[PDB]
Design a protein around this ligand. Sequence first.
Ligand code: NAG
Lengths: 260, 196
Amino acid sequence: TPIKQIFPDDAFAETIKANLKKKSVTDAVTQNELNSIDQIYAPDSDIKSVQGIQYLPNVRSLKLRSNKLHDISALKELTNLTFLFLNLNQLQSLPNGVFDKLTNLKELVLVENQLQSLPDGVFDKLTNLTLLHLMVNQLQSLPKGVFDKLTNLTELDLSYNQLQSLPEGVFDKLTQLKDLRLYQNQLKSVPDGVFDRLTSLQYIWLHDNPWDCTCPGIRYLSEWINKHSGVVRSFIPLWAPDSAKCSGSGKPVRSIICPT
Amino acid sequence: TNLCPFGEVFNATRFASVYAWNRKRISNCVADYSVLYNSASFSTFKCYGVSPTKLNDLCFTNVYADSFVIRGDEVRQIAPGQTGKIADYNYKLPDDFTGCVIAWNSNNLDSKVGGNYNYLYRLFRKSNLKPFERDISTEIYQAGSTPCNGVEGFNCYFPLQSYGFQPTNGVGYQPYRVVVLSFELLHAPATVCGPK
Ligand SMILES: *[C@@H]1O[C@H](CO)[C@@H](O)[C@H](O)[C@H]1NC(C)=O
């Protein structure tokens, strides 16, 4: 049953053409050939629609940059996906439940988009995820318990956003987390004990946030940084434990001695 | 007849940052690749389009030696056909590469308590680099629709960060020095040969 242009978008079609190594997008393809695609990689693309990808069931790895694509609903059928990487500077909304079937997902990367908010429970089914990166978006808040089901997460990157606060106990379930990046945000404070259960943590980035160093509000963070100073890292040149700085003073958060 | 200056590329006290990667053109000299390959000094010694056991037996028009520092878990990106921040935005090898990628742990030289910030990489770019392209620009990156006017702010980010290697990092996070040898045979006599 040979057919092609199962992908209406022309840029994406050439991408499927290149993957299957054929003359043009008019060339027919079988189902056996569609089932041969394990990896799609579309750098620096102009793809506007990924319609037709729902029929590539054995795709395990997808990485795509496009300044035009804003719909990603087709990807909810790729149940064998282990690696997803998307750089869509127009993606503003995540379809409802889109990742709820991608239960074999190990690494999820969403960067340079415009998501200002995340749906509730969006990740709850990805119980096998090890790596989650959401940098350079516009997130202003996180949903309650949004990470609670990713019990096997080892790396979480939330840098370069607009986060003003963190929900209570948001990292409490992530007992195998080793790398967490919160730098380049708008955080004035963290919840008390927000890091107390991260027993495998080895690297944390806290700088470029406007920390409010009024006592007692900054007490937990200042005391935590001094107790766990070996785990603090920095991408700006500063003694790493001193890289979290008070707004106004510019003094290091860990230099603030709050009573009792 | 003169000796190729590989001791200068491999044993230099300071290496370049990967975004400002440093190229040295090697010509008119004798080089002993076999002593390097059998030395048991390197954690990575992978060659493409040529066998490492036959390098002393060949001659070339020019050898290029590009060196820099990256993290241990980024050495995999210094290979043909790879993707990621380093291959996309800092050092890109061509698909048809002919040469060798050599790397070694430099935690003892390039890591410092509190961090080593003299090594940088580029985090953002408009488009992937082309093979062997070098971009040393320090212009604010426009992650949004608004112009930045050369001033940092929201969605207007300085494009370079420091690695901040600490000696207590795990190996994948420790610094590694990298030497990429490119073997060229243009229309000329080959003046870079193995030992006589
Ligand atoms: C200098 O570099 C050479 C390779 O050209 C290497 O064999 C030698 O061991 C280095 N010298 C040292 C490590 O003292």
